[PDB]
Design a protein around this motif. Structure first.
Motif, PDB file in Angstrom:
ATOM      1  N   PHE A 173      48.281  36.612 -20.349  1.00  0.00           N
ATOM      2  CA  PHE A 173      48.622  37.094 -21.679  1.00  0.00           C
ATOM      3  C   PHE A 173      50.071  37.438 -21.977  1.00  0.00           C
ATOM      4  N   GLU A 174      50.919  36.447 -22.103  1.00  0.00           N
ATOM      5  CA  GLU A 174      52.243  36.676 -22.611  1.00  0.00           C
ATOM      6  C   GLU A 174      52.776  37.983 -22.076  1.00  0.00           C
ATOM      7  N   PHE A 175      52.994  38.029 -20.774  1.00  0.00           N
ATOM      8  CA  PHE A 175      53.394  39.228 -20.100  1.00  0.00           C
ATOM      9  C   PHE A 175      54.706  39.812 -20.578  1.00  0.00           C
ATOM     10  N   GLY A 176      54.640  41.083 -20.886  1.00  0.00           N
ATOM     11  CA  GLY A 176      55.763  41.859 -21.320  1.00  0.00           C
ATOM     12  C   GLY A 176      56.478  42.478 -20.157  1.00  0.00           C
ATOM     13  N   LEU A 177      57.432  43.331 -20.467  1.00  0.00           N
ATOM     14  CA  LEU A 177      58.215  44.062 -19.503  1.00  0.00           C
ATOM     15  C   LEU A 177      57.695  45.494 -19.372  1.00  0.00           C
ATOM     16  N   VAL A 178      57.610  45.986 -18.142  1.00  0.00           N
ATOM     17  CA  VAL A 178      57.186  47.358 -17.911  1.00  0.00           C
ATOM     18  C   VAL A 178      58.299  48.134 -17.224  1.00  0.00           C
ATOM     19  N   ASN A 179      58.379  49.430 -17.495  1.00  0.00           N
ATOM     20  CA  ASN A 179      59.342  50.263 -16.803  1.00  0.00           C
ATOM     21  C   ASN A 179      58.946  50.401 -15.334  1.00  0.00           C
ATOM     22  N   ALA A 180      59.883  50.221 -14.405  1.00  0.00           N
ATOM     23  CA  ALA A 180      59.524  50.241 -12.972  1.00  0.00           C
ATOM     24  C   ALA A 180      59.911  51.512 -12.211  1.00  0.00           C
ATOM     25  N   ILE A 181      59.911  52.645 -12.910  1.00  0.00           N
ATOM     26  CA  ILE A 181      60.294  53.942 -12.342  1.00  0.00           C
ATOM     27  C   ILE A 181      59.521  54.232 -11.045  1.00  0.00           C
ATOM     28  N   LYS A 182      58.223  53.960 -11.079  1.00  0.00           N
ATOM     29  CA  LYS A 182      57.365  54.221  -9.933  1.00  0.00           C
ATOM     30  C   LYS A 182      57.836  53.446  -8.703  1.00  0.00           C
ATOM     31  N   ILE A 183      58.555  52.352  -8.932  1.00  0.00           N
ATOM     32  CA  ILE A 183      59.111  51.583  -7.829  1.00  0.00           C
ATOM     33  C   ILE A 183      60.516  52.053  -7.453  1.00  0.00           C
ATOM     34  N   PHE A 184      61.440  52.015  -8.407  1.00  0.00           N
ATOM     35  CA  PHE A 184      62.849  52.225  -8.067  1.00  0.00           C
ATOM     36  C   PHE A 184      63.393  53.626  -8.327  1.00  0.00           C
ATOM     37  N   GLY A 185      62.525  54.560  -8.715  1.00  0.00           N
ATOM     38  CA  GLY A 185      62.921  55.968  -8.838  1.00  0.00           C
ATOM     39  C   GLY A 185      63.687  56.279 -10.106  1.00  0.00           C
ATOM     40  N   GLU A 186      63.758  57.567 -10.459  1.00  0.00           N
ATOM     41  CA  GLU A 186      64.373  57.993 -11.718  1.00  0.00           C
ATOM     42  C   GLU A 186      65.859  57.667 -11.763  1.00  0.00           C
ATOM     43  N   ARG A 187      66.501  57.609 -10.600  1.00  0.00           N
ATOM     44  CA  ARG A 187      67.896  57.177 -10.545  1.00  0.00           C
ATOM     45  C   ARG A 187      68.058  55.778 -11.151  1.00  0.00           C
ATOM     46  N   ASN A 188      66.994  54.975 -11.110  1.00  0.00           N
ATOM     47  CA  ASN A 188      67.030  53.597 -11.616  1.00  0.00           C
ATOM     48  C   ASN A 188      66.099  53.380 -12.801  1.00  0.00           C
ATOM     49  N   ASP A 189      66.041  54.378 -13.674  1.00  0.00           N
ATOM     50  CA  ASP A 189      64.999  54.468 -14.698  1.00  0.00           C
ATOM     51  C   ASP A 189      65.057  53.431 -15.830  1.00  0.00           C
ATOM     52  N   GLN A 190      66.090  52.591 -15.858  1.00  0.00           N
ATOM     53  CA  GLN A 190      66.193  51.570 -16.909  1.00  0.00           C
ATOM     54  C   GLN A 190      65.725  50.180 -16.468  1.00  0.00           C
ATOM     55  N   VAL A 191      65.405  50.044 -15.188  1.00  0.00           N
ATOM     56  CA  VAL A 191      64.984  48.761 -14.641  1.00  0.00           C
ATOM     57  C   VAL A 191      63.580  48.406 -15.124  1.00  0.00           C
ATOM     58  N   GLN A 192      63.430  47.188 -15.634  1.00  0.00           N
ATOM     59  CA  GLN A 192      62.134  46.726 -16.105  1.00  0.00           C
ATOM     60  C   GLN A 192      61.696  45.471 -15.366  1.00  0.00           C
ATOM     61  N   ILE A 193      60.393  45.349 -15.151  1.00  0.00           N
ATOM     62  CA  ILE A 193      59.845  44.267 -14.366  1.00  0.00           C
ATOM     63  C   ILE A 193      58.744  43.582 -15.145  1.00  0.00           C
ATOM     64  N   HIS A 194      58.621  42.266 -14.971  1.00  0.00           N
ATOM     65  CA  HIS A 194      57.520  41.484 -15.531  1.00  0.00           C
ATOM     66  C   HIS A 194      56.198  42.186 -15.242  1.00  0.00           C
ATOM     67  N   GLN A 195      55.414  42.407 -16.285  1.00  0.00           N
ATOM     68  CA  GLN A 195      54.158  43.139 -16.163  1.00  0.00           C
ATOM     69  C   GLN A 195      53.183  42.526 -15.153  1.00  0.00           C
ATOM     70  N   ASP A 218      62.902  46.184  -3.691  1.00  0.00           N
ATOM     71  CA  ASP A 218      62.205  47.451  -3.408  1.00  0.00           C
ATOM     72  C   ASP A 218      62.659  47.987  -2.060  1.00  0.00           C
ATOM     73  N   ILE A 219      62.537  47.139  -1.045  1.00  0.00           N
ATOM     74  CA  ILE A 219      62.800  47.525   0.340  1.00  0.00           C
ATOM     75  C   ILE A 219      64.248  47.957   0.588  1.00  0.00           C
ATOM     76  N   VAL A 220      65.200  47.214   0.037  1.00  0.00           N
ATOM     77  CA  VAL A 220      66.611  47.574   0.161  1.00  0.00           C
ATOM     78  C   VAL A 220      67.022  48.779  -0.710  1.00  0.00           C
ATOM     79  N   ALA A 221      66.629  48.781  -1.979  1.00  0.00           N
ATOM     80  CA  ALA A 221      66.960  49.882  -2.882  1.00  0.00           C
ATOM     81  C   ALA A 221      66.360  51.225  -2.467  1.00  0.00           C
ATOM     82  N   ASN A 222      65.205  51.200  -1.816  1.00  0.00           N
ATOM     83  CA  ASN A 222      64.578  52.443  -1.383  1.00  0.00           C
ATOM     84  C   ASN A 222      64.836  52.742   0.083  1.00  0.00           C
ATOM     85  N   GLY A 223      65.642  51.891   0.705  1.00  0.00           N
ATOM     86  CA  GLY A 223      66.035  52.081   2.088  1.00  0.00           C
ATOM     87  C   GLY A 223      64.913  51.929   3.098  1.00  0.00           C
TER      88      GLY A 223
END
Lengths: 386, 390
Positions: free
Chosen positions: B139-161, B221-226
């Protein structure tokens, strides 16, 4: 009981209801026919399309007729090849899309086998089997049945496949008929001092060839070793989903033959056994089944489903008559999954995948040097065995 | 391979190694590409089976089973863990496939492996591989906020739903995805890093199509979260490199910005010019990493004209890598490694019919149907593996 099982008394009192021994016997020979389908290369994208996948050696083990098959103790002695002087459907003769494969005009068309010493004890005699490979106008047949029988006519298609030759071919320089007559002749001579039978089987195309072949053999007296013209053996064809083979004179000739017996198993919803619908007669004794009575079979079925050989063997395995009120119940342990070799025939409820027969990777195989080759053919020069 | 590994793994962004293509790199790319293809070769796509969506093979001798032992002296890895994924939202059958009737909401999604002592010598270091299974079937996948992945420090990053859902979703009721694909992968990579903390180590992540998006996401994910450091040794980070093929886009411009600021990450995106998948989604997404263009239309072995499936298929891609000499009109095409052209036809009729290789030839014998000792016939298309930690 082998002589009665092979139709000595025309299977009288053995069909309705179905004799349990005969049930297993019929399946036994039907499996012989099915083995033809299981070795036949139908992949037109291969250079070996139209050929056998397996060699003669351990043939039955390779086609899954060893495990739990204590009666299938036969050695395949000779592969049979056929061609056609006239164009025929791809269901009859199938060729590499290359048009430059193993053969331009010939197909593997069946095999000749015999019981070894163990199978001989088990079947109660030395059984010679000729098994004709099946389906993937009238002509005068004097060249077959002689001047004495000059009114007999045969389906042009069956006749062409049986009688045609390719002079340029190591495979069909002699016709399918003569290949068979020659090998059966060698076997008869080898076992002349022993009780012998000839059993011929086939489904669809193979059933018409089985019927023609059997009649030929008996009418021309090929059912006798050349060294002992005094000694005829029984010849009986177990055929399945048989189209018609000849005209009324073919039937007359058939009906006058002492040593021949044919059991035609017919699936009621299968229309193939009706063709050609005009100008032909049927020969032999008939055994009706009806696979629509099986609770395992998909409803409604179709042409392919009603016709397929494993469908037929599933019907034999479980038939209790074809009346509306008759039971259906498997009275032999025959895996229902076998139905789906070449069709999606079972109720999806059964959770058996449709059309499952295939070589691993369609025969593509990794070699020692890491190359990948199509290996869908075992080497066999098909030379006479010692 | 052992001497050059760091450059082969992108330490200098493959500068001067791509055009023309470095011979070692050619073999290196194919070697990881083959790691991804093994995913396809072990994935049961038969929707008529109760095991559709699972692995055919067990971890034991995994690579020999999928044909990566014969003439593959550099493929000495042990598969340590099978990875499973689910989705909280509906996704295409190419993403998650199910029995028509083993699991209701999960699919085998990849594996984690490591080079044994021999492989380690051969590759010049202890290589931890994470291979993400790719796109199957049709279904025409939108963008989702990826805070749960990259943390609040990276709160503007969005990922394909879709990528996010597959990566992060769980099925509480399932022994397979009670923990999400991400966590399964982080936990096993963690175990391996800790085990080999006292030696030189690398993490290589590979994937094609869907697997390529996952490979890219998981690497970032792995590099950004160490997560690229043993827990015992937070002072020691190893390189993380993704070899991806036919990669759709993964994130937005903030995803790229985050990516671009990471020391230890490298991604080589191999792209087949006629393959349109790498263009999707065409709006609002950015690509990450270094790109390596090939063009399978230049192969005299490939059927012309090709189609969606042909241009996209992984073995097509590896055939392109095997023979590419550039993508200019005038460039040559010539196989500079011994790679059987028949491999192209695993899942398509991609070669010229002239080649006489049957199309779509990958299949278990009899689709897995097998005669048993008692003469019954059963569907045997699955090897038992509890997937317990080794």
């Amino acid at each position: 009981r082998w002589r009665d099982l092979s139709g000595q008394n025309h299977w009288k009192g053995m069909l309705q209801p179905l004799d349990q021994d005969l049930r297993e016997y019929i399946i036994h020979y039907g499996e012989m026919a099915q083995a033809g389908y299981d070795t036949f290369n139908i992949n037109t994208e291969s250079q070996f399309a139209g050929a056998s996948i397996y060699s003669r050696k351990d043939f039955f083990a390779k086609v899954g007729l060893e495990i739990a098959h204590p009666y299938t103790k036969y050695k395949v002695t000779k592969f049979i090849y056929a061609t056609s002087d006239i164009h025929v459907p791809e269901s009859f003769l199938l060729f590499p899309i290359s048009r430059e494969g193993w053969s331009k005009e010939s197909n593997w068309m069946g095999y000749v086998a015999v019981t070894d010493d163990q199978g001989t004890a088990l079947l109660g005699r030395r059984d010679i089997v000729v098994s004709w490979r099946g389906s993937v106008g009238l002509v005068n047949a004097i060249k077959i049945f002689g001047e004495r029988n000059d009114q007999v006519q045969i389906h042009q298609g069956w006749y062409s496949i049986y009688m045609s030759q390719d002079e340029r071919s190591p495979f069909t320089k002699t016709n399918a008929r003569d290949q068979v007559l020659r090998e059966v002749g060698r076997l008869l001579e080898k076992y002349k001092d022993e009780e012998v039978s000839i059993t011929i089987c086939g489904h669809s195309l193979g059933a018409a060839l089985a019927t023609l072949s059997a009649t030929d053999i008996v009418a021309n007296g090929y059912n006798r070793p050349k060294s002992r013209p005094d000694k005829s053996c029984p010849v009986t064809a177990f055929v399945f989903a048989s189209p018609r083979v000849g005209d009324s004179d073919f039937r007359k000739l058939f009906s006058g033959l002492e040593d021949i017996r044919v059991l035609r198993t017919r699936n009621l919803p299968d229309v193939i056994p009706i063709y050609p619908p005009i100008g032909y007669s049927e020969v032999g004794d008939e055994f009706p089944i009806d696979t629509r009575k099986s609770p395992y079979m998909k409803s409604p079925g179709n042409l392919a489903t009603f016709h397929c050989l494993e469908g037929y063997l599933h019907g034999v395995a479980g038939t209790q008559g074809t009346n509306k009120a008759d039971l259906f119940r498997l009275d032999v342990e025959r895996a229902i999954g076998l139905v789906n070799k070449s069709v999606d025939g079972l109720k999806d409820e059964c959770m058996v995948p449709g059309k499952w027969r295939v070589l691993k990777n369609k025969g593509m195989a990794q070699q020692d040097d890491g190359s990948w080759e199509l290996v869908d053919h075992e080497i066999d020069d098909n030379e006479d065995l010692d």
